[PDB]
Structures are given as structure tokens and as C-alpha cells.
Design a protein around this ligand. Structure first.
Ligand SMILES: O=C(/C=N/O)NCCCN1CCC[C@H](CCNC(=O)/C=N/O)C1
Ligand SMILES: O=C(/C=N/O)NCCCN1CCC[C@H](CCNC(=O)/C=N/O)C1
Lengths: 540, 540
């Protein structure tokens, strides 16, 4: 029996587990309940705090994954199945995990809180690439990661009603942040040095917590990897969220024809359906004809968000806030095999021009035909307008710029010019173990394994360069967690990472080569999306 | 007695003059009347052929310049006054000039026919930079240049009427071409090998002869330098030409206060006014403030042009036609000192972004606010959106591409893809004796002095390399006159000039360095003007 694997929190006592690392052990507390299981009549409702428990809750294993769609596009394929649930599904899923070094930190230590992505319809804290044992061992920090309700169970919204207010999946993350405020000290973690970091929808969640006052008091720094709240995929209007919710009810037989009708009989009917039935009809309510659109996302109800994320970013004071932000080199390549014609991970996806013009309508949905022409103009090399290899990478940029890179640069510039110290990066190393095809370059999501030190796992066939490279990135993230500056507070030998400003727009390239400063997060392409495209669609 | 300077033509006898070049003499016949003076009741009417004359018409000096506006922006400045009239103004101006080598060619020789530019409101064949004395000596060709009516006298149009049909200045050029068919043999020139070459509005004139069936039978090859018939300034609608003609009549007091204003009494009132009075109100016919918009241009009437130049180029077969087109490196810089805010030839024109925004409306007139913002999008470096030097060259490209480079590249593409062998160039040498400021680069029109071999004039301070460079250019132009191919037929040793195709889009840079092949006549920028902007203006 180790005295360090025993911890008492406000709810009760826990028994953790000792994880091994090629550089020393780590104490892990996997599966801590932080809310009452949102089951039965509590479905679609905001979370309630987990009531205290007698005895010693076992905290040696990941708990269940929240009910979610399982990707079946490429069965057996590692590149897709690494994001699928690796524990069984359940609505009883509101559990968080806490890693802490060995020996336990004696003085208060900075805390990193991870928020998984997955388009607000999937994801789990238990995925092998979110293993925090390597980041906690090498940098002596405290890492926390929670599970939040995805899909309809987390974001079905009948706005105005109290049976389904929406954004309850965001409140789940908030409750885990409130839990960290009250209990991370028991693990050696400093509740006054909390750094949120998430990827994709997780990064969009981090941004929505920057713009929600009740969440701002629970953390002090932010890291948004390949995502932002102002993206065209991360929010939905009240009327549209109502239309999608009523559609889901109809697809599962609600209301029982004919009874109606009001929001209180609809949610009551939805609460009687098995969870898998609700998931079986999730991709069945939206326009049905576009990659990158997710059915149940955060709604702008006026509650969690007083206004749209774009408005709150513009009219917001960000002094005293430090933000690390960045993207990958090829954000859109992995999304093109999910509907874009001519694309297939098992060939070269050398699309024709007809497929390119059709792929733009799928990558950029709900736009006028005139607006589609402007995208084709901006993204065509008119010296080689029919080269398949160039058309493939253009559509990869069309989708990458519209969904990730330009919503991120817009946010980053607006933050720096309004008081926030901002640092920017672009991940430009393709893992030597990557299972996706070569033409996808560095796809969306494949920087996470390096931020979490996964190359240090001796069972994985990573190179010596990637091992040293992962240690560099872990120091960048941890230094930003400790000081708010990814540069070491003393080392002048390592190249300097200059802050990102709305004018200079400086960022660094993260790869095996030393740091290199560059200007412009695709400045030309993003001027089309952020500046010109709204002016057109105003004049339909 | 030198019987060389004595030539008889179908109309009578002429006596010429011997001009000296550093490499030999040349026989010149300057001032040959090819039409009855279009004065009195013949003003605004199509030209009548010159009736035969008794005696020996003197042909040793240039005749009068057609009545035209005189540029007074920079008095005494070489850069502007080199294009101003250098003979007395008169409506008696329909005269042409013929240079021929000494000794006179015995076998038929190919002939170049020059059509001067000047926005259809100015220009004259007598300008020093159009001196054919060097092109004829060095290449043993026949050069012919005529005068045509400009301004209201050449292009005032009350369409459909008999008194002012319009395009009579283009008919003046046609008449000089029919005269070349009937009399060029007398000078040693082959009427079955005549190649038109013009610049700016002259280049647009050459193109309008390709698209007019009666003119097409009078020449075999075409050269268009920095101008094309499909430009936004080269033509005007039928109803707008009527509006401009009636406005000019009002400004000079026509019709008198109390009489009707039908077409036959309007022109009768215009014919009684002194020519200088019509010229003094030519620019008040456009109340709009805009660089590059000229008051009286060729009208699309159905007579000289059965449809618009853009329509005829699209539906035309050009097999058996050799074309040589090209532009200068900085087409629009010469015109920004003519109304663009913040621009002055005597400072650096480091304009502010406000001035760049205002200048776009003046360089691209008659476009919606939504269309101007698209131009600002395409032509702004968004990493340096306020750098004055970059904004200056941006506006220089905006104006140069909209008015010259893209209408030409559009024409060059449709020609090659429909039968015509096309060669393309970009003039990139700035004259060592150029008087315009350094920041204008190679302005519009400053390749002409090298095509005409003016650097060989011993009275000028050109460099030795410009002498050799001018000789090389004259060889290209004459070869294309003989062969239809600017490359020397007896030499694979020199760098080769590949044709211009609608796909490869190859051109060469003409400068002191040897030939260099490049691809794309500013293809990215021209896709905005030729492809997207019509789609934008169609949806209003
Ligand atoms: O990454 C992303 C999206 N980016 O946009 N993943 C989306 C996963 C796919 N999804 C949407 C497309 C439709 C599909 C359901 C089809 N399933 C069947 O069984 C059909 N039988 O006809 C679920
Ligand atoms: O090359 C180009 C075209 N670029 O578009 N030249 C344009 C010809 C110049 N023109 C501009 C507008 C009219 C103005 C006449 C005013 N003259 C006065 O004396 C007024 N006193 O109030 C001179």
C-alpha cells in the first residue's frame, strides 16, 4: 500500500493507481465522479454536483464513455478508430481524471485541464492519445481531464424551455472546473494557476469559457488547438436548434401521433427513448448534405453566451489573459474523405475539376452560388486550373481555412489587439507512425500525440528525433502553463518565440527543426473569409 | 538629280526627302493626302478618297495634326509634351507617310503600318518617337503611318443618323489601308504582306480591324502593344454615345434656345462651330471624375462592328492569322498622376490607405461599392495593408490590369484557342533617359522608342546596350512582319520565343538580358477581372 495513492476530496476518499514512465512513476486518479449521473428525468438537464459518498471509491480505471456515434467509415483502420470509444457507452459518464507526479508535489503546482474534441458529438477522456502520464512526469505538473455530454444528450436544445435548455455539455465542463477549484489542492495542484487546453471542439469549448463570465473565474490561461468558438460549425441559432431537436423527436416517434406538442411533452417523450435510439438518428436531422456540420452544438440562447461568439470576441476586454493558439499544416485533409467526391484514403485522391467545384459546396455549405464562385476564384491556380494534385490541396485548404485556420486567426488577432498576450504556432511535423495516406500531410488532430508525450511510450515505434521533439513541445506547453510564456524563463540559447500581435502576426513553426518565426496565419486566404465573404452575403 | 525621291501614285506625283541614319540613308514621303479634307459639310462624315491632282505634291514634311486636346498637366515636361502635337492643328489632317529604304527595294517588300494611340482623343503620326527612319534602314522594310480624326471629329456619333454615324476615325484608318493596297507597290512594298501594328488606342484600333470584315481583307498580320478592342475604355454603347454627343452640342450652344433638337439640326449646328470650341468642351461631356474614361471612342453600332468586341472575339475564327501582343511592366503608373489622390510625379507618391481606397474608384469607375471592395481584397497585401509603397504599386496594378493587361490577355487567349498563332511579350526595360520618376518603372508607351530604333539617333544620350537592345527589338518586329514569327529562321542558336497558347500561356521578357520564357500574363489578377467580376456585376 502506497500512502500517495490515497486522497480525500470534499466528496469522499479515492484510491488511485501508479502508472509507469521510462523516467519514473506517476500517480493517476482515473474515474472520479464529479456529478450525479444525468439519467432518467435528469436527461438533457444541467449537471448536479456529485453528492458525498461513504467508503473508498475506486479510481484506478477510466469510467464509461458518454453515448456517442461510433465512426464506421474505415473499420479496423487505426487512423479513425483511435478516436472511437475505448470504454463501454453509458449515460453514467460524468467522471474526471487527475494525474499528479511522484512524489506528490509539496508546493502548489500549476494545473493543465484537457478538454477533448470531436465536433460536440464524440470524444472521451480515456483515449490512448490523451494519456497524461508522460506530460506530468516530464514537467511535474498536474493534469486534469473530464468527460462531458456530447451529441443530443449534451446539446439538444429547446431554447427557452427548462426541460432542455441546451449547452448542458458545456456546464459539465464548468462543473469539472468548479471541482478543480475545490479539490485539485488535495493532489498538489495550484487552483490559482489553471490552464485550460483543448483541441478542435475542445478548443472551441475553451473559447466559449473565455466568453462566459461564470466560467472565467475558474481558470487563468487558455490554449486553443485547431479550433475556436467563432467557427461556422461550433454554434447554432435558437430557431435552428429548435428545428433540429423537433426533428430528432419526430424520427424516434415523438410526439406520439397525435398528441403534441409543447416543449414539455416533447422532452418527456424523448426521456423515455433508449439512448442508442437517439444516437441512431443523430446525423439525420441537419441538411444531410455537407461535411463539417454537426447536429447538436452549443446554442446561442442568451444564457451561457449573452450573444454570438463573434460579438463577444469583438466587444471584449482581454487584459491580463495569456493565450496560446495554433493549427496544423493541413487542417482539412482528413475531413475530405467524409463526403467530398473523388476522395479516398486508399488512392491518391487526384480529383478532377468537376469534383473540386462540387467539393466546395460540401466543404462550404449553406452559401450562395455566387459565393461559391468567389471561393473557386480565390483557390484556383489559373496557370494550372485542371491539375488534380493542385485541386486536391486547394479543396483541403478551402475546408481547412473556412473551418479552422481563419476562425482561429480572427480570434487570435482580436485577442492580442484587446489586451491578451497571444502566442501562435503551426504544427508542421508528420508523425513517422501516421496511418493516414501521405497526401494528407499533417492532418487535423495529429499534434495531440506529441503534446502528450506519446512518443515516449517504449512500445510505440517512434524515432529518436520525435522523442526529443515531443519533449520540446511538452516544455512549451508546461512553461505556458507555469509562466504564460512558452519560452524558458532563462535559456537564451533556444530560439525565441515572439508574441502574436494583430499587426506583426508572428508565429513559429513546430517541427524537428528549431523554431522559425513567420508572419501571417494564411493572411491572404483568411482576408477572403473574414473580410470579403460577409460583405457579399449581405447583398444576396 | 536624285530620281529616287520622285514617285507617282494613282492620284498624282510626289516628291520626297532623304533622311540620314548612322547606317545609311532612307527615302521618306511625308504628307501624302489620302482623303479629301473633311471640313465644312464633311465634318463628322466618313472620308472621301482624295481626288487626283495636277503637278507634284510636296511630300518632304509632316502635314497638320488633327484637332485634339493638348495636355497641359506638366508644361515643359518631356514625358508629357513628347505626345503633344508638334505641327499646327487643322481639320485638314488626313495625310499619311511612307518610309522606304535606299536604294528603293526592287522585289516586293513587307510593309509595316503604324496606328498611333492617344485614347481616340489625341495623337499624330508626326511625333518624334514614331520616326520610321531607323526601322526602315536597319530591317529593309516599308513603314507607313497615317493620321486619323480623333475626339469628336473622329468619333462623335448620333447613331442611326446620316450626318454623324460615328467611327469615322476608324474609317480614316481603313481608307489609308485601301490606299496602301493600291499604292504601296510604287514604293517597293508588297501589298500581300502588310502587318498592322499600333499602341494603346492604336492597338485597340488594330484589333477593331480584325473584327471588321471590310478591314480584314486589307492586312494579314496584327501587332497590339498595350491595348485591345475589348478594353473597358475602347468602346461605348449606342445610347451613351448619343448622350455624349447631345451634351457636347449643349455645351457649345446647340440647338439654339428655342429650336428643335432632332439629329439633323444638331449636326448642322455643330458644323458651324469652330473646331477649337468643340475641343474646349470635350472633357466636360463626362461629368464623371475618372482616369482612363475617354469622351468620344468607337461606338458599337452594328455597322463597323456587328456586335461588341468581346462578342466578336468569342465567336470568331482566326485560322491563318499571326498576332503579336504585349504589355509593359507598369501599365497603370503613367495615369495615376491624372486624378488619383496623393499622386504627384515630383514626389514619391507614398499614398495612405485612405488615398488607395479613393484611388480605386477613380481607376475603376462605374462599379458598385461591393465591386470596389472585391478589388481592395484582391490587391491588398494583408500582412502590410498600410505600407504606402505597396499601396502605390497596388493601385498601379489595379489600373494597369483592369484597362490594359487583362483585356489583352483575354484577347490573346481567345485568339490562340481559335486558330491564330499568337506571340506575347512583356517589356521590362526602363530607358536610361526616361524623364518620368523612378517609381513609375516602365510606364505605358515607353517601349515605342525602342521599337522605332530611336536610341540610334546620335543626338540622344542612350547607352550602347540600349542601341543593341533596340536593334534586337526591330529584328523581332520585322521578322514577324516577314515570317509571321519573331524568331530568326536561320538561327537556332539564339534563345527561342515560343508561341502563346490558351493553356501554357507563354511569353518572353524583353529587356537587356537575353530572352526568358515565363507563364501567365498576370493570370491570377486577370482571373478576377475576366472571370469573377462579371459574375459579381451580374447579380448587382
Ligand atoms: O468527421 C466527421 C464529419 N466531418 O464532417 N465524421 C462524420 C461521421 C459520418 N456521419 C455523417 C455522414 C452520415 C453518416 C451515417 C451513415 N451511416 C449509415 O449506416 C448509412 N447507411 O445508409 C454519419
Ligand atoms: O491620360 C489622360 C487620361 N487619363 O484618364 N489624360 C486626361 C486629359 C486631362 N484632363 C482631365 C480631365 C479634364 C481636364 C481639363 C481641365 N482643364 C482646365 O484648365 C480646368 N480648369 O478648371 C484635363
Amino acid at each position: 500500500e502506497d500512502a500517495e495513492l490515497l486522497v480525500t476530496v470534499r466528496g469522499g476518499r479515492l484510491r488511485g493507481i501508479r502508472l509507469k514512465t521510462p523516467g519514473g512513476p506517476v500517480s493517476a486518479f482515473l474515474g472520479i465522479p464529479f456529478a450525479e449521473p444525468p439519467m432518467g428525468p435528469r436527461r438533457f438537464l444541467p449537471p448536479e454536483p456529485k453528492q458525498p459518498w461513504s467508503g473508498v471509491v475506486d479510481a484506478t480505471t477510466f469510467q464509461s464513455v458518454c453515448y456517442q456515434y461510433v465512426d464506421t467509415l474505415y473499420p479496423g483502420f487505426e487512423g479513425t478508430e483511435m478516436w472511437n470509444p475505448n470504454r463501454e457507452l453509458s449515460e453514467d459518464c460524468l467522471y474526471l481524471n487527475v494525474w499528479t507526479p511522484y512524489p506528490r508535489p509539496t508546493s502548489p503546482t500549476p494545473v493543465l485541464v484537457w478538454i477533448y474534441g470531436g465536433g460536440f458529438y464524440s470524444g472521451a477522456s480515456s483515449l490512448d492519445v490523451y494519456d497524461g502520464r508522460f506530460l506530468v512526469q516530464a514537467e511535474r505538473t498536474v493534469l486534469v481531464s473530464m468527460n462531458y455530454r456530447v451529441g443530443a444528450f449534451g446539446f439538444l436544445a429547446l431554447p427557452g424551455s427548462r426541460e432542455a435548455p441546451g449547452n448542458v455539455g458545456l456546464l459539465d465542463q464548468r462543473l469539472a472546473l468548479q471541482w478543480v477549484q475545490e479539490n485539485v489542492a488535495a493532489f498538489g495542484g495550484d487552483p490559482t494557476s489553471v490552464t485550460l487546453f483543448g483541441e478542435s471542439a475542445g478548443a472551441a469549448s475553451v473559447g466559449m469559457h473565455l466568453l462566459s463570465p461564470p466560467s472565467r473565474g475558474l481558470f487563468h490561461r487558455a490554449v486553443l488547438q485547431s479550433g475556436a468558438p467563432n467557427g461556422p460549425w461550433a454554434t447554432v441559432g435558437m430557431g435552428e436548434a429548435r428545428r433540429r431537436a423537433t426533428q430528432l423527436a419526430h424520427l424516434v416517434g415523438c410526439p406520439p401521433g397525435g398528441t403534441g406538442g409543447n416543449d414539455t411533452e416533447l422532452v418527456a417523450c424523448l426521456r423515455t427513448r433508449p439512448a442508442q435510439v437517439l444516437v441512431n438518428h443523430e446525423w439525420h436531422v441537419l441538411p444531410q448534405e455537407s461535411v463539417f456540420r454537426f447536429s447538436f452544438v452549443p446554442v446561442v440562447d442568451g444564457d451561457f453566451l449573452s450573444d454570438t461568439p463573434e460579438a463577444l470576441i469583438n466587444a471584449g476586454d482581454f487584459h491580463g489573459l495569456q493565450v496560446l493558439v495554433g493549427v496544423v499544416k493541413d487542417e482539412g485533409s482528413y475531413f475530405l474523405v467524409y463526403g467530398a467526391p473523388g476522395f479516398s484514403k486508399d488512392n491518391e485522391s487526384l480529383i478532377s475539376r468537376a469534383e473540386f467545384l462540387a467539393g466546395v459546396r460540401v466543404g462550404v455549405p449553406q452559401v450562395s452560388d455566387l459565393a461559391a464562385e468567389a471561393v473557386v476564384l480565390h483557390y484556383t491556380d489559373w496557370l494550372h486550373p485542371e491539375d488534380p494534385a493542385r485541386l486536391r490541396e486547394a479543396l483541403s485548404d478551402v475546408v481547412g481555412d473556412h473551418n479552422v485556420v481563419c476562425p482561429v486567426a480572427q480570434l487570435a488577432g482580436r485577442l492580442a489587439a484587446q489586451g491578451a498576450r497571444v502566442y501562435a504556432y503551426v504544427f508542421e511535423h508528420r508523425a513517422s507512425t501516421l496511418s493516414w495516406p501521405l497526401w494528407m500531410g499533417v492532418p487535423h488532430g495529429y499534434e495531440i500525440e506529441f503534446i502528450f508525450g506519446i512518443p515516449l511510450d517504449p512500445s510505440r515505434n517512434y524515432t529518436a528525433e520525435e522523442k526529443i521533439f515531443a519533449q520540446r513541445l511538452m516544455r512549451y506547453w508546461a512553461n505556458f502553463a507555469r509562466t504564460g510564456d512558452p519560452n524558458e524563463p532563462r535559456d537564451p540559447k533556444a530560439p525565441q518565440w515572439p508574441p502574436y500581435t494583430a499587426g506583426a502576426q508572428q508565429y513559429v513553426s513546430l517541427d524537428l527543426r528549431p523554431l522559425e518565426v513567420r508572419r501571417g496565419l494564411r493572411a491572404q486566404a483568411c482576408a477572403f473569409w473574414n473580410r470579403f465573404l460577409p460583405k457579399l452575403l449581405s447583398a444576396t
